[PDB]
Design a protein around this ligand. Structure first.
Ligand SMILES: [Fe+3]
Ligand SMILES: [Fe+3]
Ligand SMILES: [Zn+2]
Ligand SMILES: [Zn+2]
Lengths: 336, 336
């Protein structure tokens, strides 16, 4: 360090050059008065750092890396193996071809982090995965949820719900923010199939066949409502069936007909949305675009409740996963 | 009904006129083959209804209301007391004056629905409420959570966390979607105060004093990161401190300095965001805009984790509430 050196600039050889501001070097101090090495958490608010902070001394040894003494006397050490590290979504499917690639073996994702990461990444991108067990296996659903997400999304229902045994729907449309992902587990299966359609593909299909119904569905709000006196909850959400972002990408689909009400659509647009809605539903019922699942015991299908329509003495067990948690499990498994 | 009558139009007297399309009247049928009166849920998908459906007969008795026989022979009855019903957010606070109006008595909201509704509505609008008990009272936290939301938001921590006993922060910034609301409960209090600042007011304040720092903070992304090896979760979110919607309304604030990293800000913008961030934090530390709370036992403060910065042998118990659930409880309590 000479007085007035504007920032740190290191030549790593072969034209790789790192540049580091003093303010950020100060903010990044590794010492035990600045950050907890265990919790990797900071003890100060960056906001207090003196903006014009300069160092008094900058010394680099090949022995103990980069050592800085700041103007205020503080001392920081930076390993070169640290400075060099800093010198630097949805895919539609109009038909069930990509679901072969998205069937994984229970044992693999239970055992191997690369398989968990791989199955979760297929789920994030395509919105459905199938996790299949063997006969030698006796697949534990609580353990599989724990492997996937740590814990499930408690809802009005509880932690899980059972179906014992048909319009296509997404689930809980009356939540202003519905659960990200749903799972169905083959709790008890014998020796009529559940369908799965990508609403994103279907909505982009509809954009072409019928741009009118697309504009209507992406811009007219209907109502989803569920009264549940037992729990003292009325869930009431007014929202469009198809949601676009600021660039007109489909980013959510919301439809369960059984709680669907058109009561608040203006008189002159009512006929238009019944037509648009009926077009959309029919398009999805087309042979070709569903994936049909033959329920085997211990099967789990996890699917993106924001975009996959699904529909039906086997007994299934269902629940929901939060994107926050799946991604954090996937990120942990991938970086170890 | 005469053949070709385009829709239903009823004169309720005094110039009140209802208009009802046939398609929606069909969709709305009250009969037991169309909807479950108990679950108020529908048995069909609206999408199947024949769009050009007309009635064959429309008869209104003052005795049993409106009776329709549809072309396909279906029969529907509509009470006039049903047809007539269908013939038809955030507030900033730059200082703690509005928190007097937002202190409610535990007993009132526990007992009276109008008080629960009133306290929850103050929470939605202003982002903080205080629920205060008496000495005769022994306030139960689980019962108070149940009264407010039915259930709390399970998180990485669990259902609740304890603090036993300082930069201003919002909590869990490393969640891509952080919890909507947080609560702090006075579990064990004796006979140094927690501050509360509205980030929305502070951010609009900053827009005026320093539009540069506003633009920087609303457009430059920083990183919030929390590694938790015990739970096999790495939470990593890149996001701006101040979030605007398409009309430039502040709709979320995200900052806990202890997990905050600027590592991925471009070299040329680093100095700008340290300045902008430091301005923002300082503005909020100004005398006047905090609300300071004197912790009494059995107190609960519920506050909007999307916008209220807060900061510190008393022992507090904390957890999180979902907007979905609070609103559903408030809507249920208000409509009974
Ligand atoms: Fe379902
Ligand atoms: Fe906190
Ligand atoms: Zn240090
Ligand atoms: Zn009917």
């Amino acid at each position: 360090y000479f007085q007035g050196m504007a920032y740190l600039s290191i030549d790593w050889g072969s034209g790789e050059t790192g540049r580091y501001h003093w303010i950020w070097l100060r903010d990044s101090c590794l010492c035990e008065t600045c950050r907890n090495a265990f919790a990797k958490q900071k003890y100060f608010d960056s906001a207090t750092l003196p903006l014009d902070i300069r160092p008094r001394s900058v010394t680099r040894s090949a022995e103990n890396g980069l050592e800085i003494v700041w103007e205020d006397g503080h001392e920081s050490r930076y390993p070169d193996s640290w400075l060099r590290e800093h010198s630097t979504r949805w895919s539609p499917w109009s038909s069930a071809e990509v679901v072969a690639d998205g069937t994984f073996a229970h044992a693999d994702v239970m055992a191997d982090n690369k398989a968990l990461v791989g199955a979760l990444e297929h789920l994030f991108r395509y919105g459905l995965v199938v996790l299949r067990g063997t006969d030698a296996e006796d697949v534990d659903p609580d353990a599989l949820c724990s492997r996937l997400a740590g814990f499930v999304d408690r809802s009005y229902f509880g932690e899980y719900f059972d179906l014992e045994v048909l319009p296509l729907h997404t689930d809980i449309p009356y939540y202003s923010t519905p659960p990200d992902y749903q799972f169905l587990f083959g709790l008890e299966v014998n020796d009529g199939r559940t369908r799965f359609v990508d609403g994103v593909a279907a909505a982009l299909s509809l954009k072409e066949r019928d741009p009118e119904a697309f504009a209507v569905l992406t811009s007219t709000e209907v109502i989803y409502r569920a009264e549940y006196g037992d729990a003292e909850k009325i869930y009431h959400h007014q929202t469009p069936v198809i949601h676009l972002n600021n660039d007109g990408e489909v980013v959510r689909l919301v439809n369960n007909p059984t709680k669907m009400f058109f009561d608040n659509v203006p008189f002159d647009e009512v006929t238009g949305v019944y037509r648009a809605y009926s077009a959309f539903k029919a398009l999805m019922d087309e042979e070709g675009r569903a994936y049909h699942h033959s329920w085997r015991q211990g099967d789990m299908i996890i699917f993106d409740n924001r975009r996959i329509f699904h529909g039906r003495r086997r007994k299934l067990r269902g629940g929901y996963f939060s994107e926050v948690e799946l991604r954090a499990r996937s990120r942990f498994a991938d970086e170890t």
